[PDB]
Amino acid sequence: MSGPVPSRARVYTDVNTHRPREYWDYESHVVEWGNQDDYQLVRKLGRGKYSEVFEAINITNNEKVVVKILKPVKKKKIKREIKILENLRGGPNIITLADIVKDPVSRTPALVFEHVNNTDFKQLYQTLTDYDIRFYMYEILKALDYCHSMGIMHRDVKPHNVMIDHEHRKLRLIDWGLAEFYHPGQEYNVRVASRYFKGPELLVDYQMYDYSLDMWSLGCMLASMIFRKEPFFHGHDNYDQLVRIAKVLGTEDLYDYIDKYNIELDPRFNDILGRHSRKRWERFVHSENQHLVSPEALDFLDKLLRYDHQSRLTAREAMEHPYFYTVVKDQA
Numbered sequence: 001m002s003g004p005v006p007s008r009a010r011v012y013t014d015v016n017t018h019r020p021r022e023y024w025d026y027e028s029h030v031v032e033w034g035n036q037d038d039y040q041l042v043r044k045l046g047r048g049k050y051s052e053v054f055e056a057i058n059i060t061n062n063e064k065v066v067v068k069i070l071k072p073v074k075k076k077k078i079k080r081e082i083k084i085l086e087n088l089r090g091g092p093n094i095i096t097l098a099d100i101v102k103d104p105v106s107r108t109p110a111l112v113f114e115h116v117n118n119t120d121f122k123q124l125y126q127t128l129t130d131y132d133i134r135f136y137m138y139e140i141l142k143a144l145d146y147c148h149s150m151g152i153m154h155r156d157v158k159p160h161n162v163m164i165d166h167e168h169r170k171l172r173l174i175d176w177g178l179a180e181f182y183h184p185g186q187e188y189n190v191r192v193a194s195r196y197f198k199g200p201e202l203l204v205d206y207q208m209y210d211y212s213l214d215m216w217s218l219g220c221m222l223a224s225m226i227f228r229k230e231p232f233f234h235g236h237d238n239y240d241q242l243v244r245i246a247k248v249l250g251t252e253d254l255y256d257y258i259d260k261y262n263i264e265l266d267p268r269f270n271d272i273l274g275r276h277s278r279k280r281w282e283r284f285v286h287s288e289n290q291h292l293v294s295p296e297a298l299d300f301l302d303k304l305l306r307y308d309h310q311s312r313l314t315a316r317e318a319m320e321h322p323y324f325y326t327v328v329k330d331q332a
């Protein structure tokens with residue numbers, strides 16, 4: 001009946017605003033295509049959605065690389081990823097776009113990324129130590145703070161998008177194919193991110209979201225890691241996703257969130273959330289995960305997983321949490 005209350009990023013609100021138009025205007029951006037023959041496809045890695053990736057080698061200098069060929073997708077979408085990748089290139093822990101080559105495989109070309117010898121995310125989880133997790137979480141935070149400071153929301157933060165070469169302690173945040181430029185007052189598509197990592201704002205159709213979305217997804221990751229339940233919030237659909245969350249954060253804070261921003265609750269919700277108390281994080285601590293848990297980790301996770309997007313810690317203040325006190329601190 002009314003309408004929802006507007007919202008804006010609590011930090012880096014207008015980093016794109018006064019930057020040259022070329023920076024964020026990706027649909028008019030045109031690319032100087034690299035050469036397809038410079039790379040030799042060696043093996044097909046994994047199995048990608050609307051895109052297939054391969055292990056490969058640059059013929060001109062035998063450097064190992066990963067070629068990502070794009071499938072039947074709209075131009076402006078390819079441009080968006082390319083433009084975002086080029087802009088963030090050089091930033092801490094951001095995957096480096098080594099090249100973009102033209103190839104008539106389906107009206108779509110290919111993206112060349114630096115090679116990351118990452119351990120199968122599924123087996124790696126099970127071998128990390130308390131320090132490894134604090135270290136890696138810190139590295140991801142560096143990537144988010146930098147990208148957010150460069151005006152980009154990743155929108156698909158999850159274990160599958162964090163390549164980790166554990167032997168080299170090298171970490172890269174990948175798949176910027178859903179990333180978007182933040183503009184205050186803008187209403188974005190709530191599709192983005194994987195179900196299990198979607199912030200409440202996406203689940204209740206709140207379109208004026210921001211960088212803080214990535215912080216919720218990061219929280220879901222953290223939770224799955226320290227508690228060893230991957231994923232932590234496992235819902236069946238958007239509606240069930242929020243229910244899984246409420247069974248932990250409670251329903252009261254959820255109801256307070258929707259009222260604060262005057263959110264139109266869909267018929268499918270009024271009776272599905274029910275009534276749940278706020279559960280304590282210590283409840284999920286058992287003999288299989290206690291070594292990756294600590295009071296600061298719990299306090300940290302608690303400041304990340306908040307219904308209200310504006311209340312969640314920003315990447316930078318997350319890096320200032322005691323949870324990361326032990327982590328290196330050499331700043332270089």
Ligand SMILES: O=c1oc2c(O)c(O)cc3c(=O)oc4c(O)c(O)cc1c4c23
Binds near residue numbers: 053176
């Ligand atoms: O930069 C990437 O490196 C990768 C890999 O090294 C890999 O082994 C598998 C993948 C993969 O499955 O999907 C990807 C994406 O959708 C994407 O946008 C970027 C990358 C990968 C990727």
